[PDB]
Every structure is written in structure tokens, then in C-alpha cells.
Amino acid sequence: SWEVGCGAPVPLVTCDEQSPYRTITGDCNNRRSPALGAANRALARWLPAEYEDGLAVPFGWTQRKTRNGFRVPLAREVSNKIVGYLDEEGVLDQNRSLLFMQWGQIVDHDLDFAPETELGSSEHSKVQCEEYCVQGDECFPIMFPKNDPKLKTQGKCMPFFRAGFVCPTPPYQSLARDQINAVTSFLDASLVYGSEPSLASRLRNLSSPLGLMAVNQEAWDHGLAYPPFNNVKPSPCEFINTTAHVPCFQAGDSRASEQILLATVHTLLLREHNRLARELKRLNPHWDGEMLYQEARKILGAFIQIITFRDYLPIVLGSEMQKWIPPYQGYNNSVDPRISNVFTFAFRFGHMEVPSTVSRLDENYQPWGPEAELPLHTLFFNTWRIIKDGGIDPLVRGLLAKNSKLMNQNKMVTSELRNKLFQPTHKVHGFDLAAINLQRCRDHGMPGYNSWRGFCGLSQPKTLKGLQAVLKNKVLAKKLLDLYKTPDNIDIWIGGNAEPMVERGRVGPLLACLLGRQFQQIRDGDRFWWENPGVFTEKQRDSLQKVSFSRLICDNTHITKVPLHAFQANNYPHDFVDCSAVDKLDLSPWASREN
């Protein structure tokens, strides 16, 4: 059945047996099978692919054909009829801060990315998808249904390009299409350091041997730094306000500038490296430049792994945490550490947690000026609002103080995401994230709602009422199989997100399962997990325990009142305290006086 996984990546990476440092590619984590967990390779398949022609063609590609005897419903219509909502009033999650949403993206972007297919540059295929909405090749477009108001305003389709596949990027037929992953499967701060050895050596300041991450020369934030600008034109960030031409930020991940806030928590991560690396010459000046970068890298990875697993996962998984993430019991060389395909869709659950507006607060957590509260749609690829409109202190402040969206069945994904999305390649603020998610399922795999209900050993419904009592909504059950027509054909993203939430969490029975499994595998399979004996000295761990996001901001911003629990909804002034009462990171155990 194997062929035998194929693949051309970073053509040449061989291991060091006895060095304590991760590679950038993610190779040599596992000794036995050195590629497992690496980057630019196939996403894993917990379940066989489900295509029309059986190998590559997404369900609903040809007209005449059907998944299970029925015509699959258009993505934008499924969107139009189930997902969106008019009234923003009263969706905000009452026990979760914007940081809850925002750290969801950081962790995600650390774990998976399936790059879209541009076998196109100086090209007409980009044009043939945009202009003429002609399906074929790699242009698999999102049509508008009858009586969509995008028709009067935009056209017939939303261009949509198929994601990358392996063993060759050109046209090919054979096996079953597996989608590529351009980032390392481990929580290793790939998004801050890069995943391509070539990109990783460009984000660095090899000018001076303090082992520092290369910063911005031209823009400044009260003495505190910014990531460098990606000085390649064209620039999605320059496009949305040309008068100030401020390009996007350069980071270990392409997507760093997709949104204002994403770029903010990303500038906290960069600043933290240069602070640790600075602090670490202070103690052991005998060190060369790479042992600076590398030690600071290891401790920053430790940071992201500790916050993700101790503070985020329990408020996302909830009662199902103990079920899927049992306490730690060492390392397993036999576990697959890789991101499976379905995960790249299950973890998109956050798209229903993004609220309509992003606000900007002053030094008393009070609205910051005349235009404080900005619509989220004016914020995609917006770097000018942070270099030019006050730095990151008014944005870190909103993260701590403001609620995120609570996923609601009657209110699923905001219209700012579902109607006015800016897409980097294109010019309009009017793509649909909910619709673009649904085609993306069909592009990738992707076994229906029931296949994946079975994976977790849950009731696979069958009937209008067999769904009614699973989602606990009679109207949503109707709407769902009015379009899909059998519970089987429901795309995971919507089918999974449609379920009510498990006790003390933010996802449901199915999604808790898919999410839980992956997060356990990536912990149990990572040789460099912070708790495995060997990677940190027993002292170092006890200092690493003292860290919090609350501190990530006290050491790297001029915010001086913060919550003690930054992931849950709390109010200024009351729940906010001085940086002084917040535990610091004791870096003493990292000193190694030579003689």
C-alpha cells in the first residue's frame, strides 16, 4: 500500500548524536526514524482520504457526481444559511480574554501550515481563477448561490486555490493526495525561529555575538523593538494604506502579519528572545554567539510548551483534559509526533472565537483616543496601526481586558470574518472564511462528520432526530441536513463546531477528542519536551515553572498593571495588579562558570 511516502524537501540533513539542541527543520528528534516530525512533508492520516475520483478530486468538483447519492452543498451557501449572524450584541465569552483566542493561533501556527499552491507567478491561472471563475487545474473556486448579495457586488466566485501536495508540486496522478506541512510538528517556537534553515539564519543578527534575533532599524516602540520588515514588494500590508507605506513584519512564519493582534503577541515572543539572550551573556560571558541563540531558543520553546499545556489546554478541553492528556510519564520513541490532516481543521475552532472589534486602551485601561475601537476587517495585514498608531502597549492592554467571542449555535463566525476577509494575493475585503474553510476540507481529505464520530467511538447519527439529540438544537439539525441531506456528508469543520460544548471547556465531544489526541501525541513524542529528563537540569525546570504570559508582558512592555490570570475574563481596576506581585523567571541555574 506504501509507495513509499515519496517526498522532496530539504534535500540534505544528517544528525548530531550528542548535541542538546533541536534542529530548525525538526529532523533528528526521533533517532530511529529521523524525518518523523519534520517540515515540508505530508500531513498524517488517521483515516483514509475521501475523494471523488478516488485519489485527488474533491467532492463537488464535477456536477453529475455525488457523495453517497446526494449533491454536496456549496460552501458559501452552507455558510450563508448556518454560520453568519447580524446581531453582535451579547456574544462575548464571560470567562475568556482575547488572549485566549490569541494564544490559540500562536500554538496552532507553531504546529501546522499547508501552503497554498502557487505554481503561479507572471501568470494567467491566477487570472483565470480571479477573472473568469473557471474551475480546473488548481483553481477550485467558491461559487455564489442564488440571491447572495456578493453577486451584485463582486462577481460569480471567490477565487480559491488548492493546497500543496507531495512527491511533486506539478500536475500528477497516483496514490492518495496528502497535503504538505511547511512547519515543524513540535511545540518548538517554529513561528519565532523559522522552519527552513535558510530563513532561520536571516532573522538573526550575526553582526554581533550576543546571539540576538535581528530587529527593526527604522521603527521603534519606546526603546522596545519590532520584528524586521519583509522588504519584498508587493506587500499585503502596504496595499491597505499606501500613504504610509509600511510593509509586513518578518518572522519565523509567513502569517505573522495576517492580523494586528497576531503581530502583537508575536512581537512579545521576539522581544523575549533578545531579553533572555541578553541576560544570558550577563551570567556567562564566556559563551560564543550560537550558544547564546541556542540556549535562549530552548528556554523560549519551554515557555510556549508550559503555557500551552498548563493554562490553555485545560480551559479549552475541560472535563475531557484528563481523558486525553493524562499526566506525563516520560518519552515514547514509538509515538507519531506529526500533525494529522484533520487537526488542521479541528483546531480552526478558534475562528468562532474572534469578536467583531479590536480595541486599544490607554494607561488606565480606558479607551485610547477618538477611534479606540476598530472593526476587525480594517485590521487584516495592518502594520501601520502599530508602527504609526501608538505601539503595542494599547493592544496588549486590550488583550488582557477585553472578552473574546463565545461560540454560539445561532451566532457562529462574525461577519467581519465571514464577509469582509482580506486575502493577501487579492485586492478586495470580501472573502469568506467560513466558506473558504468548507472547500478546504473537500480539498484536503476529508472524511465526513460520522467517520470522525466513529474514530472517537461516539454516536454516529443517521436521522433528523439522531442529530437533534446530539447538537441539542432542532432548528440547527434541520438546517444542517436540509443542505447535506444525510448526517454523513457534513464537513467536519461545521459538524464538529455545531455540537454544544463539553463541561468547563470551549469545544465539544468530537473536537475535544481530535484535539486531545494530537496534543498528547506531540507531547509524548517530542524528545525535547521540557519535562523529559535530560533536556533541562532539575533546577532549571523549577524556574521554568514560575513563568506566565502575565510576565511575558511585564519584561517586554510598559504595561505595569496586569491580571494574575491572563487567560480568563477579569476587570480593571479590581482583578489587575502590579508587575511586582507576579513571579519572575530566575535565570541563575543557567550559569556555568568555566573553571
Ligand X SMILES: *[C@@H]1O[C@H](CO)[C@@H](O[C@@H]2O[C@H](CO)[C@@H](O[C@@H]3O[C@H](CO)[C@@H](O)[C@H](O)[C@@H]3O)[C@H](O)[C@H]2NC(C)=O)[C@H](O)[C@H]1NC(C)=O
Ligand Y SMILES: *[C@@H]1O[C@H](CO)[C@@H](O[C@@H]2O[C@H](CO)[C@@H](O)[C@H](O)[C@H]2NC(C)=O)[C@H](O)[C@H]1NC(C)=O
Binding residue per annotation — 108? yes
Does 109 qualify as catalytic in the annotation? yes
Catalytic-role residue among 109, 266, 273, 444: 109
DSSP string, 418-431: HT-EE-TTSS-EEE
d(CA 394, CA 431): 29
- Does 38 help bind ligand X (rule: CB under 6 A)? no
Q: Total residues at the site for ligand X (CB under 6 A)?
A: 6
- Whether 586 has a binding-site annotation, put simply, is no
Instruction: Tell whether residue 37 is a contact of ligand HEM (CB under 6 A).
Output: no
The residue behind cell 492518495 is 176
Residue 112 binds ligand HEM, judged by CB under 6 A: yes
Question: If binding is defined by CB under 6 A, does position 386 make contact with ligand X?
Answer: no
Q: Is residue 555 classed exposed, middle or buried when 0-12, 13-18 and 19+ CB atoms within 10 A define those classes?
A: middle
Q: ∠ at Cα 22 (21, 23), nearest 5°?
A: 115
User: Of 411, 440, 453, 551, which lies in the binding site for ligand HEM, with binding defined by CB under 6 A?
Assistant: 440
Binding partner of 335, given ligand Y, Ca ion, ligand HEM, none, CB within 5-8 angstroms per partner class = ligand Y
> Among 107, 157, 215, 510, which residue sits at the site for ligand X (rule: CB under 6 A)?
215
Contacts with ligand Y, 235-274, as mask; x by CB under 6 A = ------x-xx------------------------------
Would you state the torsion angle of the CA atoms of residues 327, 328, 329, 335, taken in this order, to the nearest 10 degrees? 110
Q: Does 184 belong to an annotated binding site?
A: yes
CA-based nearest residue to 409, from 342, 508, 319, 515? 508
Which run of H or E residues covers position 438?
A: helix 433-444
**DSSP track, 1-30:** --S------SS-----SS-----SS-TTSS
Q: Is 148 annotated as ligand-binding?
A: no
Of the ranges 65-73, 100-108, 264-272, 571-579, which one interacts with ligand HEM (CB under 6 A)?
Answer: 100-108
Q: Is 362 annotated as a binding residue?
A: no
Is the Cβ–Cβ distance between 514 and 341 less than 8 Å?
no
Stretch that binds Ca ion, among 37-45, 47-55, 180-188, 567-575 (CB under 5 A): 180-188
Q: Say if residue 422 carries a ligand binding annotation.
A: no
207 binds ligand X (CB under 6 A): yes
Say whether residue 414 binds ligand HEM (CB under 6 A).
Answer: no
By rule CB under 6 A, what string of x and - marks binding of each residue 186-205 to ligand X?
A: -------------------x
With beta carbons less than 8 A apart as the criterion, state whether 189 and 301 touch: yes
DSSP 247: P
565 makes contact with ligand Y (CB under 6 A):
yes
Residue 138 interacts with which of Ca ion, ligand X, ligand HEM, none, CB < 5 to 8 Å by class: none
- In the complex, what is the shortest distance from the CB of residue 311 to ligand Y, in angstroms, rounded to a whole number? 6
Q: Are 486 and 450 in contact (CB under 8 A)?
A: no
- Report d(CA 345, CA 322) in Å as an integer: 23
**How many CB atoms neighbour CB 206 within 10 A?**
13
Q: Cα 417 to chain center, whole Å?
A: 15
Q: Which of residues 360-379 bind ligand HEM (CB under 6 A)?
A: 376
3 among the known binding-site residues?
Answer: no
Least distance (Å) from ligand Y to the CB of residue 75?
A: 31
Breaks (C-N over 2.5 A) in the chain follow: none
Q: Which residues does residue 181 pair with via DSSP β-bridges, in sequence order?
A: 41
- Catalytic residue positions? 109
Per CB under 6 A, residues contacting ligand Y are 95, 241, 243-244, 315, 332, 334-335, 384, 388, 565, 568
Per CB under 6 A, residues contacting ligand HEM are 101, 104-105, 108, 112-114, 258-259, 344, 347-348, 350-351, 354, 376, 380, 436, 440
Per CB under 5 A, residues contacting Ca ion are 110, 184, 186, 188, 190
Per CB under 6 A, residues contacting ligand X are 205, 207-208, 212, 214-215
